[model samples]
Target: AIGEFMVSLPRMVYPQPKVLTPCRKDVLVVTPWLAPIVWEGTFNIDILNEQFRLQNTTIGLTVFAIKKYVAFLKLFLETAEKHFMVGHRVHYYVFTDQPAAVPRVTLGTGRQLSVLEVRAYKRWQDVSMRRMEMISDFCERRFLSEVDYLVCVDVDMEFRDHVGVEILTPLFGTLHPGFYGSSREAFTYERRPQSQAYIPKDEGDFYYGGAFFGGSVQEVQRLTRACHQAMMVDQANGIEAVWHDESHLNKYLLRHKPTKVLSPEYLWDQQLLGWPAVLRKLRFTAVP
Candidate 1:
């Protein structure tokens, strides 16, 4: 059950995490609430693998590929098979408008895929905002009994490096590639008081990307449900947030902090922003 804590880890010989010396001195490894900030050097995959494997953890990855976005599914699904939760049980929930267009990407031993057909929205904004409602609906119908953790991501990206068990937590959000270094005042959060996604200039810990965010089934459901509800309220008021679902997501995370925060490495655009020394690995990236 998801409620039970991981009690023990198998005995393994690995480098001990030093208390005197930190893993990465150049970056922040933890949030103010003491939740771990997941970076390449902050954890040992060997240790985390043992802990999750002991519990027989199953991870479900959800992605939406509507209209022309379906063309990117081949590369996205293929790369995921190579890097995402490689050794654990993985169930990929692919939501698409044209089910037949979804490429038949091969899967590993413990991995599987399900193609769910959804109506295609005319405008990009509508498609993006409606994702919250779709994910929330599916969470109650399928995710609760299907998987232990749910990873919601955009389809127009690909996994480039090992993105494994180290990311699993009750709830997590990834730092936006463009705003990781910017201050709260510079963040692109909605500023209008009339919008449900409004945030004061003095607020905001991190400008999280809507491309990647996930948690346990219950936590994810709560987040998606909340975001969907908030978006509806904005619609009724004759206003839309500046960044659509992402704006609402930031507001929700501010009130309820995530258990783990993934660094920009988890969601980067190497083409736009060249490889900086601060990033040790570009685990997942935008395909452009």
Candidate 2:
């Protein structure tokens, strides 16, 4: 539906965007590649909602709740219902190792959830690494028909504020809360050249959080498939990237820039960073 041309915007009144005045002068609003870096005050959600809703856009949110993570689903699902794309058609794909452990949570009218049983990996790293393959597989087998877009994320988080249609793009990645303000050199990219996920210190962009990222269904599938292939090459070589799938993700995004980049507000840790004056709203936050 994202490909559909806008017919018209229904009559609605809202404050006009000041062209001369900037949204947030303190933080960078656009990436070097001209992709918009999503932050509070940068967009008007009411308008975005109308645009996406008019197209009848269906968003599929995927989260993996393997092993002990099944316990976090109740709160995650409840908070997502409260804040994520509230009025739009949403399908939550909860991929879990223990389908029986998945908690039952109430949903809004236009929102639904599906529990997908998957094989559990013994190691946490293996669980994280396999997500790329599994998500890519599902994108081909299910998401292509079920939804227009896919938002893949970790389960141990909660929505604290509005997170809606403003985020839907061809492809997008959220800034890692741990390294948003830090220089590229400080980013924890895989340094070893032997690994397929390697990124040298001199060449890098934003450090994207593996916890949150998404795009149109086709684009997400492309990204996940690419990462899975890269991880496979590393496995064949008897080497593992420092950050597993996250390292490969960084490598992929380095070459193929995301259409939009979300600010730390979309993925944050209140306990570690506290509430910075710059972050007007911590929309999605770490559960701890």
Candidate 3:
């Protein structure tokens, strides 16, 4: 496949003297497309943190917590206080139907939060699909001026271990735990050719979960906008992807691709899928 793909930045190592050590000895760190798949050992958090800190980097984290989901904010923020980018500037943007219902969780010295009120969608399906449009709208209007990188996550999830600056890249997608080990044909991509989100059975690098993904302001802006417009097309055609925004996301990543791919360590459901040897660290997990 020579000259058939792109190249990512040269793998950089700190304090080395012509000694070669792959960031992730167990897995491929850099892809043929040049993006890195961010695994735990693939990067030194200290070096990455130093680099981002010196640049005065600010990361904005966005989460949707409508209705009953608002209850998750307390733990999400509290745990984040203990583990999420502790040394960096973090802005938590909470979009919910009830601003008053948002938890009064305290943040670390370098962290702050803003609760933005939004409409409550009675149907969970609508809430899942509309998130793309809402994020794209705000990325254009708000996030662009406020932060260097944006990390969008699902409110129902919580950080279980360190989720620091190492995961930050231009654009990244996490492998869905359910499909990483499965072959491309086994991927659960939207199969309906009638819909814009459709991906043929033979296509796909990996099935990425929509629960967590983001990147630099401009890149995420492009991704979210594309997904939203695609979903709109599906809506107009009276067709919806089987997996809501996730299906469109898989399609987008199939074409545009992510600058980085996060390992399942960034996302897991311990209760549903018990800890296995492959997972050295379970950083984030679904609530039981």
Candidate 3 similarity to native, TM-score: 0.91
* Between candidates 2 and 3, the lDDT winner: 2
In model 2, the runs with Cα more than 4 Å from the true position are: 122-128
* lDDT values, one for every candidate: 0.92, 0.92, 0.85
Clashing pairs in 1: none
TM-score of each: 0.97, 0.97, 0.91
lDDT of 1 by residue, 222-268 (tens): 99999999988898898999999999999999999999999998999
Tell me the tens digit of each residue's lDDT in model 2 across 5-122.
7789989999988989999989999999999999998998888988899999999999988779888999999999999998899999999878889888999998988988888678
lDDT-better candidate, 1 vs 3: 1
Listed per model in order, the count of residue pairs whose N, CA or C atoms clash below 3 Å is: 0, 0, 1
For model 3, the stretches where C-alpha displacement exceeds 4 angstroms are 1-25, 121-128
As for TM-score, the candidate ahead, 2 or 3, is 2
